[PDB]
Ligand binder design. Sequence first.
Ligand SMILES: [Fe+3]
Ligand SMILES: [Fe+3]
Ligand SMILES: [Fe+3]
Ligand SMILES: [Fe+3]
Lengths: 419, 426, 425, 419
Amino acid sequence: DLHYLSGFGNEFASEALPGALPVGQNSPQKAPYGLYAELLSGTAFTMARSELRRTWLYRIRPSALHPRFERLARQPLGGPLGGINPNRLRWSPQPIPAEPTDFIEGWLPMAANAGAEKPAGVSIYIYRANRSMERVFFNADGELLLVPEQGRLRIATELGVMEVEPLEIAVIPRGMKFRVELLDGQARGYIAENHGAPLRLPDLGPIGSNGLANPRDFLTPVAHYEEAEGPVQLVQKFLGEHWACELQHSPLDVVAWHGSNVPYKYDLRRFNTIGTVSFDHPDPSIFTVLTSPTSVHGMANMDFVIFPPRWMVAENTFRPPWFHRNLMNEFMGLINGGFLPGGASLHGVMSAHGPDAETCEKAIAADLAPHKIDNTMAFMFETSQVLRPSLQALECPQLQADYDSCWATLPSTFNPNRR
Amino acid sequence: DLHYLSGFGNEFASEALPGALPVGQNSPQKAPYGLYAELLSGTAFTMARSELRRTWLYRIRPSALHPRFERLARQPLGGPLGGINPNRLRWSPQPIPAEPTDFIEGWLPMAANAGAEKPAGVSIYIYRANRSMERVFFNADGELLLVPEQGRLRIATELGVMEVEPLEIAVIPRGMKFRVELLDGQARGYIAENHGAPLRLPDLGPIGSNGLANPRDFLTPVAHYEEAEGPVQLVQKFLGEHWACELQHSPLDVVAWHGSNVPYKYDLRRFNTIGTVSFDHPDPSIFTVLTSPTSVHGMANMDFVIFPPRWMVAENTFRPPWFHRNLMNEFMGLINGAYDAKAEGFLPGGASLHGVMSAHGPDAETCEKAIAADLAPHKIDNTMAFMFETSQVLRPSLQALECPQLQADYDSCWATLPSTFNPNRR
Amino acid sequence: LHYLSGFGNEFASEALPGALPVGQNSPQKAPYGLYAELLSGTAFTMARSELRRTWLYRIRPSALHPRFERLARQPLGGPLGGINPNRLRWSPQPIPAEPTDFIEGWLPMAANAGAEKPAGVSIYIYRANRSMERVFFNADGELLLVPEQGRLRIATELGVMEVEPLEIAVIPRGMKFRVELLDGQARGYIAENHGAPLRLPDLGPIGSNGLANPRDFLTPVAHYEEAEGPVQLVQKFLGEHWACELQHSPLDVVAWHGSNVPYKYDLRRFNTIGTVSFDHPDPSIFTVLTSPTSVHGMANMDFVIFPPRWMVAENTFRPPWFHRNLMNEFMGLINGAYDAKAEGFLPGGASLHGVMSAHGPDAETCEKAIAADLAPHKIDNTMAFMFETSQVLRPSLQALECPQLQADYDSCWATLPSTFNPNRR
Amino acid sequence: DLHYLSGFGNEFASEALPGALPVGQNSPQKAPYGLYAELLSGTAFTMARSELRRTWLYRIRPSALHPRFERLARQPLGGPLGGINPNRLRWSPQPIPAEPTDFIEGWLPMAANAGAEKPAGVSIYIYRANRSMERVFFNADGELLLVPEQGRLRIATELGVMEVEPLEIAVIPRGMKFRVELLDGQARGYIAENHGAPLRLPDLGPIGSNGLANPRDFLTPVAHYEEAEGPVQLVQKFLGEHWACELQHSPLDVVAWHGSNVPYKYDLRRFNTIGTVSFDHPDPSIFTVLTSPTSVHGMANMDFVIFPPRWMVAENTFRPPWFHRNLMNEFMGLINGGFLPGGASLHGVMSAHGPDAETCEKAIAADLAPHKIDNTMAFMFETSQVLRPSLQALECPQLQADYDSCWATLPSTFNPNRR
Ligand SMILES: [Fe+3]
Ligand SMILES: [Fe+3]
Ligand SMILES: [Fe+3]
Ligand SMILES: [Fe+3]
């Protein structure tokens, strides 16, 4: 029975004790309950207000109260970049490791725009974990988009507690402290780490003022603070590296807060899917849930896109996705329903992809009538920068060695003598 | 039949005689065939190239060769703006007048953002004609969007001839000369006169790089010139007035041209309609065919929206348009069939106007039907309604306010909406 | 006279040493006991590139004035002319016999809107035969002055500038000034800009230099008057002259700094760009100053010139092409003859080719141009110009009823022949 | 005989068989002639339509029908980065090598904003070839601007065939498959590989609505397809590397196509040159033919600029290019007419350049009259990012070792007692 505040991008305000929030100002000399005011600035001060992300926290002890960070010996993300490889790639789902592995220890580097030491654009991982985190963590390297596939997550953050289950997504702003509890003992899922402009709702164009992901469905947890006394490890990811310090208090000691730099979750089942109600096959940008822009208008750092249960009604139309060569880079995953839940495919810049022969023959031969796609949920992380597969990803047992064969049996159907 | 060039916004090139277009330049000293170069600038010289519209003409006689224009006695567009009236308005179809009336003489002012003498925003007319034009015409007050409802038009312009039937639309650029022949003896339809930024394709947003009105379906006619020798009246519309002069030559004497300021036509049947494949009822802006922007981003001078055959699949959803009050001003027409928010009273050739913040929506009948219905995939078919939606208030003409076609009891359409509210049962 | 240079500069000028406060704008104790006064030419929140504001340090505050009263003599009070799409041409305007100072002799030619609802651009031709014995400001817009006959000595709050034909001058909205005629009488053109202040055009590929170089834009140094006695202060508000009487000189600014300034520019210094190959470039290429709108690329008005220049286009119809324009073209002539008109267009003359009016050369200019052997040719000893506007230019009733309006302008195009032959390329 | 479609940025449509193009839609269930639909997306789907480049293809076999790509042993572009060097540099023309070398094998990297493995901005090459390509190629790393200097090229692309001779340029969109055939036995010329926003026409500013490169002169080939059966090698350039696979069919099998992502050519001899008709010496940006923007307004990724035959008429003026120090980086080449055709010069950020003593002396002394510069075509690739010369370029024999002496005789003509 966790409570949530609704509305993407809102100036929220939540207090765990009556009047814990200062009224009419952010920095009283005598803060209610004797709390410390702290500002979390997720963007430059001078952004246009529409881009502004900042949260005022009123907490038991300042975040400044911490000893020196030291580099952990254990570094899940220190593996090298893979060699150059233009090929189409597909993986089978990643098995959960035997060794104890919490949420942060479990990120397996799949592909990234840059080396972990110079975070830029987007880095993509698959997380595997068999332990709840017995420590607190923040990412200095970017925003985190989590896409669960197996197992629920109870995520306790500075702003409050949220639970996410497969078919839901969650986002945790850069630098925000959080701790992940595995409700089901173990967990698997995907991560897009956003090193760039924070994820937001796409420009709707002609779709207008409603549709796709409705702002009312983005939920942010209410204030919740901890009073545990005794040592707690605080871990941060900085330029790919986990550095840690030990606190003698719980860093999740925020009693009240206000602002717009907030963790949130969204249920993909609430997506107001838009598609063709006539013919043809619309561009997959139409399925956009969240997007991270660049200073180049129209070209996203990354678009998060889903392929949800939907009605198929295209008349006189080849209904599967058409054959395609793309400037952008397509990383596909599957949440449920050769491509299994937990699996992945990377078709990079100008790689030729599309349906196989059996998909083609069946689509061309189909008696086209309205059809409901159901019990499936796929998605794509599409990035503008090339995604370089990690060495780990290219060498792991789960990489399919004959993925190219999927297209081998495509036939010519060309007859010059009959249109 | 007629040949066309495809591609909305293209730099086209067309010549009626081989090599009539100068190669490598626009202004030769000794132009091919002894023709005159002439530049038709549809926009300021300094527009962004994406916003530029200009066409080079290679013609027998320059357009400048004409004597003084004189005001005609006959002025279709000279009637006063009607009184202030915030009411929801509905007209039945406009009958064709008895007296001889060509295409330009036949425009009936329905509503406009401003007085005809001070053109701004959009002016809306319904045309009614029973004569083919035996003169040539250009509108200097703006761009014309034509929406035939009865009868095919054969439109002879400077750049060539195009034919338009109901379910197709045609655009004529401001200042471009043309002549309308009625292929079916008489004709009736709608006009949006755009006084603002030229109509163009909407920004597709998440729809991406394909969909709605695909550019390949926008057709521009090929070069064609007449050589008739004898008097031709040339009329122009200026500040709402018709002014004429007599020429001793045909002003459709353009033997070749190149450029982007072109007349064009579009078959609405080919609209790649996008909608809900899930639930709810998408905003009608999703149906945009063409749009004319203002300097305020996101707020169009006018959107041209259609309501075409389309699959209705939304589950657990009130399917007809929702009840609505709107900053924008909604002028709706019907080209054929029946519209899905309405029941009676709205026929082909009819119109409705719901202005700024007027409360509109479905009737009691429709609401009852939609709430009880067993929802399943359903193809809406054999229908084409549309809307001219404008940001500026539309002021009905006096003629519109006083005509027999104005329906006297339009408000009673919503009279029977019942309360179904039950506070004890969610 | 001395001047400062640099279009758009933050200028600083003092007529007494240390009269400008150093390090601040508003001292409690101003140097020499002067009053600080801010002239805000633009909204406070304009981007800095678009900011126009001047700090004045003056003997008496502009606020020291009694109620303005409406003058009986109203130069600009005439009605709008009727609707008329025709091509129009006017001969030079005679200088009236009645005593007529600078502000009294504005002959309204055409305007985007009625004088009482100013918007866009209003065009006048001024004719004066007396020097101004009063001071004037225009609340309705910025003034672009294009002298054609006789030199002007213009005393402004910021200093004195002298303008002769082939120079232009611009005076910001609200800025007080007095005009002296150095040659007894004067004639010329005005573009009254009700919209965004005139500035230098975006050069595009022309780059970082050329057309009108900013170094050539000149602003007067501070000058102040201490004269004690009655002076009439007139303002133009919503087309009307209103006036009060002061007992001091309002040109009493001892020191000033900032960017809201009067300026002049010598068109002979224009770095004219053109074709060095073929064809005939769009006349936008001759843009001197422009006033934008919120619609990018569509100016409220462009001020363009047609100066001495080299004509070198090979295999090219060199005169301006036949044309039909969305924009509205008001042309005038400072001296000499214009390349597109054989005759009927003289210095002081004017033409108006409104939206989509068909214009171009005549059959005589045509004939010679098509026939001429082409070699490099220096067009010289001429200066014409255009006020091109996006909004329609409505001629005034005066302009349409005045004896200088040529009755048979269309006849200039009547003899254009068909040289068309379907069967030889 | 080759036919072409005209109009830069046009939505084109071309079909080699009557009605090969589906009418009214892009994705029919039963395509005309049994062809496959393939979308080539040259930009993000959500680009403003003015910046959108995409082409629908209707082809015999899908592009996906290919086996695994493998790294070729021969690698033309793998040579390391030259060392740091701020000096002005000038090269004599490049000799055509003895060894058999086709178009893609004969790119000599001259200088680049970045290393081959991390394409950004612009890479500049000189190609030398003595064999026609007997295979097909696409470049995944960027768009190709070709500037022939010696020998004509017949470039067979997916969208059709075009012929380019010196004094013409050709552009090939990223990822588009093509084959270069040498009509003259061998060929040499320059290449600007554009890794950024695609080249387009420059904003004309006051020049207005016509002039410079007029859009009507940009020509795109009509549809042409091959039905040759037998092994064919497909090669791609990815992160600077040549990777290849073998198809058992021609990949130039597009029967029809429509859209805006097209190859094109343009004859520089049609450039409507603009310049001074009064005095002074206009900035060479006035000669821009094509430009690649950045997100920084007014600061191009690259400008392609030409110095063609033209009238010089400036009076009381020093007519040669002024003495000059530039933020931008200037790579000069010469097509026809120390600096020979095929040669190059690099003046990088803030290097001081300008005329030599002989040029100054003659120019200050000349009796200025209209003068037609004729029979000469130079050009420049100006880039915003520093161009690092390749190791190869810095150690090549054609690098002129005494270039700085060109300016060594510049004298002082200063005289303070005579204005
Ligand atoms: Fe794809
Ligand atoms: Fe509505
Ligand atoms: Fe003109
Ligand atoms: Fe330079």
